[PDB]
Structures are given as structure tokens and as C-alpha cells.
Unconditional design. Structure first.
Ligand SMILES: Nc1ncnc2c1ncn2[C@@H]1O[C@H](COP(=O)(O)OP(=O)(O)O)[C@@H](O)[C@H]1O
Ligand SMILES: Nc1ncnc2c1ncn2[C@@H]1O[C@H](COP(=O)(O)OP(=O)(O)O)[C@@H](O)[C@H]1O
Ligand SMILES: Nc1ncnc2c1ncn2[C@@H]1O[C@H](COP(=O)(O)OP(=O)(O)O)[C@@H](O)[C@H]1O
Ligand SMILES: [Mg+2]
Ligand SMILES: [Mg+2]
Ligand SMILES: [Mg+2]
Lengths: 372, 372, 372
């Protein structure tokens, strides 16, 4: 009778909802905003901190901080604030009568999940909770069993291969290059056209510009030549103070960092080579099914050229006798939450919860014994 | 009214069917596979063991083990699993109403036969059972009564001479050099070209390469010279992951171990010398008939150069006035099963079964006093 | 009158010197570094590539590549750079008047040895060159004739048994698991404590951490329990930028892959099982002498728990009436070079060189008819 709660706490967004639903009920940015100026009007119910959409609406007088950086919770008081807001203000629910399912990026510090379990059991004390890997939930949402999931969000980009329900943990690859780094690089290269964005609110503006006008090119050199030749790739964006900026090759130079990380001085390979190397680390007999089941999840995969570019690159890397399919569902921005709702509604999962009694007996160390 | 069952349990393959048929109904690999990677998805009916074609089709996440090694059952739980699979899932029969005929290589340990009888009477209890030697079944299938049978399979290569229905057990020669050793030698010599196959799953790939591309050279030195001079003996093979590997002299070096065991460090003589030595241990009055009635059986005799090579070698060893003939029927891979089905259907064999009453009276030791 | 050169090119280090000596003259890492950032100061003697110690010293602005992977030369221009550095800059010698001895792991591709011969005779033209197996040299340096050598370096781990100077190639075992794999595994498992090492410059830092702080436990479960109980096994390491990290069970979990390869997803057996399997594949009359003469060589055998652990494991596997003795000399990091210098100084070896006239007459294939 007691329904469960699925809460995906990503680096940039929080997606919370109820188990068994098709879409998350609450989606809001994971920011805590604090006033930086002097208050002069007495009364009027001024608060010392702001969370979520309230921080975004008043961001012109606030400094915004992200409690999660690269999938790791850096500030715990702010994260506790975010959880309090998502339980009592958005979902409008009492945490002490609902089991909770949370998510974790692969190859993360163990202290992160230990303190997550401790806060959930000692501050928002729940009957049960479960910490799950995001790529497995994305595969649950896709409805299939074999596939290699590339999950790219705001802090982390990771590839995880799964075959017939079994993971190959030695082939999991993690890259700390995601949407926030793309926002930073776009911010840096906008200074070539005279536009100066420095503050935290201007970072939100640049992120909005990236979400609106950026795309992944099929061929980088040809698009550069086209942008140099004619003014056909230039788009105009209107700022909140009515100013209009015009961007050209920066529309496709920003997500190209996903394929050329050396644009921001990193030594790693692109996401295509990382995926290919993750497939080559697996057994030979499962590579054929891995090539045809590339599943893309997360908001950083929403650029409207990324599937074709990925297919072209992996086809250039893979043998010519192989069929390569890139799976990009239209609702892949919410794939982790949809998979968590699918998993938490299964009758075969109800014995895999971490109960309050087990936590009391074992302490904040059972999260490694019961969760993979 | 009760139909008899014929099950040939070799080192590599299980050939099971009903007596009176022309071909075995169920031929499947004799392996048990178990998961080695980490299962991350719940439900979906995951099993803790896979047997037969289900293990081979899913081998990329499994470790594969052969219960039978060199014709001796090493693991008995897995052997019971194989027998259960071949009685229920493949043959779709209830063993409580069908006598069973089984096969055993010459010069085997007694305990193997004893435990086979005990399992067949106490786990899959049968009205009666029998254990037969493979070479007499091969000579039954060949249709003749006199001849020398060279049976080479996956674990054992044995020569048995028979004259007018009487065997000479002192001339029986057993050699533990068969198909698995050839697969291992091919795996070793494929590293000369940079190809690495290490795991148990890749052993099956190398086995397929051996079954498809290898052959026996009529003269080994001239074949080596031909391979060194021109690239006319090279063949390409496409791997499961789409890689293409080219092999040259390894096509005829791998089965050359049958004629030169010293390639794998074995001091024994070749198969031709073993056949000649078995013939020369017999009486002088039967060697003329044994020379002209050489019968081959098993899957190791399926290389497309072995009959001519054996004829040439034995003609080199034998007197020039004798006629040497090699009998290589196209169905010789299934010769043991065909001979068993012919034998189990005879009206004079129904008195030679080991019934349940006699097993209760004598225990698992009547298999020596009733089976030769 | 011409002094012979002894050069050992492993996967990680180059040990070069003159025959007849006791220690190699030049021991330097086998890496080539190339700049990855933008040069802004004109002139100043900037080079396009760096080799050896100079590449390691300037690694903060360089990308470092290993020309040899798993004992196989993957890049040949970098290999020519390494050999030019070790001939003209380190040894300070002219190659045209010194014969050269090179080493190679067992079960390598033939093309590697052929191209080594071709490069040594056509680019660094030597009067003579000879390629030898590393384990035979280790037995030469050990002073004895009978023994089984376990040589583990940076790319390969191979077992070679020798009895009275005769080798048994069918019992030679090779495992592609060595120091670099342990470095990668340590990089993976240091992420549990929040440390992120990604770039190739940080791989050397992790290698230094492994060389200074890692060790092999005598009992794995007991040491895991001890680490879980108290913080007595924890050690601190200072990073190049002054940061201090602390590691606990990661000290002994990293080399345990040599005994449990499944930690990195490999299906193979541990080094103790591989040594026991190599002993069991030999003749029965030499196993007693192989048991008492386990010879350890290579830098991966330098952990301060590995001899006792190997003795315990082999004594567990071997019959109780056998004397198992592990021979781990203090200078076993340079056993290959010492054996090569011993062999190249023998008067009975001077007729086994491959002169330039023989190479001209036969081509780059006499290295198979002359070298074992
Ligand atoms: N349509 C889009 N095009 C490009 N980038 C997008 C788009 N939508 C979202 N993003 C990026 O995705 C990131 C967040 O995606 P998501 O995975 O849903 O959140 P989280 O990373 O917190 O899980 C943001 O940094 C944003 O810049
Ligand atoms: N066409 C072929 N060429 C060469 N070898 C073959 C061929 N077909 C099967 N084999 C080998 O025969 C062996 C098994 O043959 P068979 O005697 O029928 O089974 P078992 O040895 O279990 O009795 C396998 O090891 C396989 O490698
Ligand atoms: N004290 C040590 N303890 C453990 N490992 C070591 C130690 N010193 C060196 N190594 C390892 O030995 C490897 C190379 O050893 P060596 O065999 O001398 O070189 P190569 O493998 O190139 O022949 C390196 O990868 C290094 O990690
Ligand atoms: Mg996410
Ligand atoms: Mg057989
Ligand atoms: Mg070495």
C-alpha cells in the first residue's frame, strides 16, 4: 500500500517523483542561492537562502552554488536543503512513510553513498532506501537487457556495458567532461565576439544559449569552412535586458569538446573512442550485440547532431562487417528516472530494499554489501 | 513395446536418440557453463548454470567446463546435469520406461562404469541398462564382422582389432591424443601471427577454425616448402567481432600432431605406427584381413586428407604384397550411435541387459561380469 | 677485442650495458614523450620529442607513450628512437663495432623478432646480433642449470621449466598480466578514496605509489579483516604538488590480482596455479627438481610478501612429501641482464652469433634457424 519515491539527484538537475508513474512529478535545478547585497527594506519575509526555481527567478541578487560537482556531493548542508525542498515543498510528502530510491554515478567515492544513506536514515528517516547505478536504470527504461549505455549529464559522462543482465565492471569508463564543462568552454569562446559573461547568473544564461542554439556537426572541418564562407550558420539570441548576441561557429565548436577534449586541455579521448575502447575490453562474443545496442541517456546527448556523428565515428572505428545502431529515444533526458520507476515497481525488487533494521544492525556500511 | 535409448557420451559431444533410427535425434555440446560476471538486473529468470547449446550461445558471460576429460568423468554433478538435460529437455522422454545403452572407451577405470550404472539405476532409474565399447559399435555400423577400428574423438584415440566377432584385447591400443589437444596446439601456434585466444570461450572459436580450415598434408615437408614459396595455402576467417585472421601452414601443422605427437611433447608413436603395431600383435593368419579392413570413426577423422595419408603410411610400413584399404564412410562421425542403435534393436541382445533385479541382487559390480 | 653489448628492452624499462660486467650501465624508462600544449617562447632549444629520463622529468607538458605493449613492439619509430638513445646518448658507443644481445618473451609473434633483426642489421648495423629468451638468461644468472623460472615484468608473466639445460616448450606458460595492469587497477581503486588519476603523467605517480607502498599479504581475508578493524596498515604518500594521500587495504589489494586475476575480469588462474600447472605438464622424474628450484625474476616479483605467499600456495597445491623452495635473490630485478652478460662472455657462445654475411645470405628469417 505504501508507494515508493524515485529521486534522481544529478549534478545540475533534480528529478523526483513517485514509483509507477511515467514522468517525474518535480524537476528543478540543484542550486542553492544566497544574497550577496545589502538588505534595506525591513520585513517583507526575506529569507537567508533559496533553492531551485526560486533561486533561478531571483538570481540577479544571488550567488548560486551547486552542491554536486562531478557527481560528488561537495556541500552536505546544501544537499540536505535540496532534499528537504524536494520532499516537503515539491513532492508534498512525508519521508517517514515512503521508501526512497536514489542514484549514483559509477566509480564514485564510497563516502558519498555512505553519507547519503546516513542522511536518509537519520535526518529524513525512511522505512527503506536503495542506491542504484544510473546506466542500469537507463537500460531498464529502454526495455532491453543487452546494451552499452552512454550516460552524459552535467558532471559525469560514463559508458557501462551490460549483456543478458550481467555487467562487465572491468570495462566501465568514466570521463569528468559533461554539460557544465561545455558551458564553461562556451563562456570562454564567447569572449572572441566581445560578449563578457562572468557571474553565476550569466553562467545560467550561457547554459540557456547552449540548450537553444548549439548542435553537433557531422564534419567539423566542413562546418568550419562553411561558417568562414557564408553567414548561414549564425543565430541571434535575445538577452534578458533586450540585447541581441549573434553566434556562428560557436554553435558547433562547443559540443565538439565531447569529441575533442583537447579543446579544454584534457588528454582523454572523445566519447566515441571511449565507447569503442569500452566495447573492446569486453568478451569477443558479446561485441556484436554491444555494437547494435548503443543507448544514449542524459541531457548532454540532446544536441541535434550527436547520434549521426556517433554512428559515423564508431563505424569508422569498428569493422566494416558490423551493424552499429545508436538508440536515442525522445525521452532520454529522463531515462534514469523512468528506469528507477520501472525497477521500484517490480515485485521481484521488494526484497532488495535496505530496511531500517538492517541499517541499525550494520551501520552506514551495508550500502556496499546490498547495493552494487 | 518399450523403445531403447542410445546415448553416446564422448569427451566433446552428446549424441542421444532412440534405437532403430538412422541418425541420433539430439546432438549437443557436452559442456556446463556458469556465470562469472556481475548480474545487475533483477528477475528475467536468470539461472545459475547453462547446459548444451544454451551455454554455447551465451558463452560470452560464462565459464565453460567439460565434465568428461580424456574419456573419464571428472565432475559428476555436471554429468548428472547433462544426463538430465538429454533425458528431459532434448529427448523429451521419461527414463522410467526406456532401457538405456551407453558407451565407454577401452582401458578406462572401472569406477567410471560403476558410477555410470549407479547413477542410471538410482537417479534416472531405468528398467535396464547396458555399457558397450565404442569400436564394436563402429564395426556394427560398418556392417562387417572383421576389421581394425581406429576411433578418434575429442579425448581418446583407440585401435581395436576384431576377427569374426572375436576381439584381441591384448592388441588394443589407447592414446590420449585427440581433438582437444589439437585445439590447444592450434591455440599455441596461432600466437606466432599475433592472434591471442586465452579464455574458454575463445577455445570454441579456435575449435571452429580447426573444424573449418584444417587438413592433413599428403607429404609434410613438401607442403611446408609450398607454403613457404607462395601464399597459395592461406585462408581467411572472420571472427565473431568482425575481425579477419589469415592462417597459412597452421592448417596442416595442427593435425600433423596426430602423426608426430612430439609436436606437443608426447613420446608416443603416430596413429599409423599405432595401427601397424596393433596389427602386428595379432596372429599372423588374420593380418591380411585386418590390413584390408581399416575402419575409421569419430570426428577427429574428418580432416580432408587423413585417409590417403594413413594409406600411404601403412603401405610404407607393411609388406608390399598386402592390400591396404581404409574405410572412411561419410557418416563416420555418428558411427558409434548407429552401431549402438543396430545392436540395441537385435532380438539376440534383449537377453543381455542389466535389469533392476540383478542390480539389486549384485550391486554396482555386475557391469564387469555382464559387459565386456 | 670488440666488446659485446647486452641490451634488455622490456615493456617498461631499458637495461643496457657491456658484456662481462656485473650491473647494467644505463637503466631508463622506455617511453617517448611529445608535447601537447602551445609553445610560446621562440628558440630555446625546444625538441619535438623526448626519450627516457628527460621525458619523465618534463612529463607535466608531455604525453608519454610506451613503444612496447605486453612485450610486443607496437610503434617502430619510437623503438628506433629508444635504441638510438641507448646507443649514442647513454652507452656513448658506436654500434657498428659491437655485437648486440637482445631479449624476447616466449610465445611472441615471429614478426617482432624478424623486424628487430632487420633494424639491428640495416639501421644500426652491427657485426652480429643474437636474440635470447629471458627466463633462460635468468637461470644463467641464478648460477644453476635446473629450475623453473617465473619472470614477471611490466607486460608479461611467463614460466619456463628447464631440466639439466634442456627446456620443455610444451610446458611454457604465459599470462598477459604484469606491472602495468596492476598500475591501472590501482588507478581504478584509488577512486574509492576520492583520488582521480587520469593522465599518463599521473600513471607514473601511481606506479611510484605502487613501488613504494604496495605489498602482498600472506592471507588475504585476514589482512582485509585487520584493515577493517584498525588503521594500522594505512600509509601516507606525498604528491608532487604537496598533497598527501592515505591508503589502507589498497596496499595489498593491488598485487592480489597476481593471485586472483578475476579482480580485473580475467578468467585465468593465479601465478601459483600457473606454476603448478607448468610443473604438472612436465615429466614425472623432473618434478621433484623443479619444486626445489623456483626462481623468481623481474620487477613485479619485488613486492615484500611474494616469496612466502608463493611458497604457501605451492605447498598447498603440491604433495606434502615435497620440498618447495622459492629462490628470490636481492638482485632479481636485473637477472635478465646479468644472465645476458654471462652468456655473451662465454667462449662457447662466440660461434652462435648471427653475422652480417649470414643475414645477407638468408635474410631476416635466419633468426628462427639460429635463435631458440
Ligand atoms: N536540449 C539540450 N541541448 C543541449 N544540452 C542540454 C539540453 N538539455 C539539457 N542539456 C544539458 O544537460 C545537463 C543536465 O542534464 P541531466 O542529465 O538531465 O541533469 P543531471 O546531469 O543533473 O542528471 C545540463 O548541463 C544542460 O546544459
Ligand atoms: N569437420 C571436422 N574436421 C575436423 N575435426 C572435427 C570436424 N568435426 C568435428 N571435429 C572434431 O571432433 C571432435 C568431436 O568428435 P566426436 O567423436 O563426434 O565427439 P566425441 O569426441 O565427443 O565422441 C571435436 O573435438 C571436434 O573438434
Ligand atoms: N619495488 C617494486 N615493487 C613492485 N613492483 C616494482 C618495483 N620496482 C619496479 N616494479 C615494477 O616492475 C615493472 C618493470 O620491471 P622490469 O621487469 O625490470 O621491467 P620490464 O618489465 O620492462 O623488463 C614496472 O612496471 C614496475 O611497476
Ligand atoms: Mg544524471
Ligand atoms: Mg566418440
Ligand atoms: Mg623483463
Amino acid at each position: 500500500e505504501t508507494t515508493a519515491l524515485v529521486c534522481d539527484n544529478g549534478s545540475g538537475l533534480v528529478k523526483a517523483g513517485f514509483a509507477g508513474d511515467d514522468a517525474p512529478r518535480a524537476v528543478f535545478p540543484s542550486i542553492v542561492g544566497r544574497p550577496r547585497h545589502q538588505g534595506v527594506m525591513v520585513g517583507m519575509g526575506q529569507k537567508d537562502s533559496y533553492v531551485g526555481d526560486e533561486a533561478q527567478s531571483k538570481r540577479g541578487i544571488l550567488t548560486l552554488k551547486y552542491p554536486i560537482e562531478h557527481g560528488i556531493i561537495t556541500n552536505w548542508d546544501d544537499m540536505e536543503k535540496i532534499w528537504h525542498h524536494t520532499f516537503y515543498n515539491e513532492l508534498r510528502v512525508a519521508p517517514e512513510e515512503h521508501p526512497t530510491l536514489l542514484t549514483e554515478a559509477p566509480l564514485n567515492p564510497k563516502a558519498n553513498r555512505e553519507k547519503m544513506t546516513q542522511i536518509m536514515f537519520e535526518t529524513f528517516n525512511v522505512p527503506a532506501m536503495y542506491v542504484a547505478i544510473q546506466a542500469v536504470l537507463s537500460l531498464y527504461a529502454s526495455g532491453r537487457t543487452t546494451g552499452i549505455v552512454l550516460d552524459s549529464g552535467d558532471g559525469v559522462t560514463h559508458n557501462v556495458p551490460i549483456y543478458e543482465g550481467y555487467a562487465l565492471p572491468h570495462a566501465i569508463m568514466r570521463l569528468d567532461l559533461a554539460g557544465r564543462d561545455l558551458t564553461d568552454y562556451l563562456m570562454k569562446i564567447l569572449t572572441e565576439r566581445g560578449y563578457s559573461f562572468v557571474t553565476t547568473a550569466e553562467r545560467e544564461i550561457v547554459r540557456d544559449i547552449k540548450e537553444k542554439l548549439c548542435y553537433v556537426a557531422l564534419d567539423f572541418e566542413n562546418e568550419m569552412a562553411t561558417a568562414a564562407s557564408s553567414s548561414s550558420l549564425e543565430k541571434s539570441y535575445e538577452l534578458p535586458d533586450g540585447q541581441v548576441i549573434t553566434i556562428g561557429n560557436e554553435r558547433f565548436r562547443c559540443p565538439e569538446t565531447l569529441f575533442q577534449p583537447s579543446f579544454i586541455g584534457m588528454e582523454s579521448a572523445g566519447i566515441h573512442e571511449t565507447t569503442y575502447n569500452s566495447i573492446m575490453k569486453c568478451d569477443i562474443d558479446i561485441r556484436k550485440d554491444l555494437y547494435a545496442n548503443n543507448v544514449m541517456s542524459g541531457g548532454t546527448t540532446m544536441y541535434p547532431g550527436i547520434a549521426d556523428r556517433m554512428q559515423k565515428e564508431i563505424t569508422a572505428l569498428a569493422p566494416s562487417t558490423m551493424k552499429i545502431k545508436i538508440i536515442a529515444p525522445p525521452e532520454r533526458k529522463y531515462s534514469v528516472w523512468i528506469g528507477g520507476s520501472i525497477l521500484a515497481s517490480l515485485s521481484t525488487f521488494q526484497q532488495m530494499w535496505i530496511t531500517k533494521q538492517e541499517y541499525d544492525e550494520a551501520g552506514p556500511s551495508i550500502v556496499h554489501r546490498k547495493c552494487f
